[PDB]
Amino acid sequence: GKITLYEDRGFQGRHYECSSDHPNLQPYLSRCNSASVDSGCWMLYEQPNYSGLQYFLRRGDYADHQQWMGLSDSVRSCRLIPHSGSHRIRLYEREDYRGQMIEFTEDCSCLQDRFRFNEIHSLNVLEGSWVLYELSNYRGRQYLLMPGDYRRYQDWGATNARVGSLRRVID
């Protein structure tokens, strides 16, 4: 994978090139207002060491931070998400994998149209990486999910159990 981050809009300003995870961009970029993804699925993080607001980027060109749904021009770490050959996620009504349960292998622009709950209280990522979104149509806060058990919403770094849409990390 390969991404180029720019301090300014329209691929202008001081830039830096990443080919792997960087936990600390601070010495290199003071801000980030545009990015070009040559290859790979990337998660950008507001704070260093893969914390704070998260943003999913794919192959493509982002001329301003609003095109990756960025609330600000703050990018201080970035993650190259591993390839997954396949994708499967179970979502549960209640914590500790209890209550109603639905299993997705494909993207969902509106969870409430298939699973009539505004909140997901646990989920099991059986295959591949996913991005959860707070709102429908891939909007609101983003949360990267690696294969794993997630017994409560805190386990995927959210401050609430609200979930409106989710998408496979695929290029």
Side-chain angles (χ1 to χ4, degrees):
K2 190 142 99 95
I3 189 173
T4 311
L5 310 175
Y6 297 88
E7 274 188 350
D8 288 289
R9 290 179 197 274
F11 317 104
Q12 201 76 228
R14 181 168 75 136
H15 60 268
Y16 189 67
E17 202 193 70
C18 292
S19 295
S20 64
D21 292 3
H22 208 311
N24 188 25
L25 295 176
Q26 292 178 122
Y28 302 109
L29 296 160
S30 40
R31 46 178 204 284
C32 184
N33 277 287
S34 63
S36 295
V37 179
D38 171 77
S39 58
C41 295
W42 293 84
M43 213 78 187
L44 305 190
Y45 297 94
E46 172 197 29
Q47 285 304 324
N49 205 39
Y50 317 122
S51 50
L53 291 182
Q54 322 178 30
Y55 309 106
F56 183 47
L57 279 77
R58 286 159 156 170
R59 178 167 209 290
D61 288 292
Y62 302 88
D64 67 43
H65 67 79
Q66 292 111 284
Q67 291 184 29
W68 65 76
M69 319 279 304
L71 296 201
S72 70
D73 64 351
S74 191
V75 177
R76 295 194 175 98
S77 50
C78 64
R79 203 198 275 291
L80 177 61
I81 307 161
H83 189 258
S84 327
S86 79
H87 292 266
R88 184 180 305 284
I89 196 171
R90 293 179 181 162
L91 307 183
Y92 294 93
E93 178 196 10
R94 287 195 271 274
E95 335 216 297
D96 274 302
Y97 298 173
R98 306 161 93 87
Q100 288 192 35
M101 186 279 265
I102 195 153
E103 186 164 309
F104 293 115
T105 54
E106 274 171 359
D107 296 350
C108 198
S109 62
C110 188
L111 178 60
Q112 284 65 48
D113 210 43
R114 292 274 280 285
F115 197 59
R116 298 190 219 156
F117 301 101
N118 295 320
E119 316 191 328
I120 307 309
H121 275 281
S122 54
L123 54 93
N124 191 354
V125 186
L126 293 173
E127 307 169 40
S129 292
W130 299 75
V131 184
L132 289 179
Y133 296 80
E134 180 173 24
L135 302 184
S136 66
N137 290 306
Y138 306 121
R139 292 167 313 100
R141 275 187 277 264
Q142 294 183 37
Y143 312 96
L144 181 65
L145 304 174
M146 305 275 216
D149 300 290
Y150 303 74
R151 303 290 177 181
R152 50 207 201 97
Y153 66 83
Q154 289 93 339
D155 290 348
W156 64 79
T159 61
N160 55 71
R162 214 190 291 96
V163 184
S165 64
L166 53 97
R167 142 186 285 153
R168 291 169 296 162
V169 183
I170 32 176
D171 210 285

